């Protein structure tokens, strides 16, 4: 992208991996 946003934005892929529901992406 143009702006990552990074950090907002990388902590997106563990949250869509379910760390809301504490499962990690790791």
């Not at 990388?10 to 991996?17: G, P, Q, R």
Request: glycine share 8%; aromatic share 4%.
């Amino acid at each position: 992208t143009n702006r990552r946003k990074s950090g907002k934005y990388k902590k997106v892929e563990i949250k869509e991996l379910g760390e809301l529901r504490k499962e990690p992406s790791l």
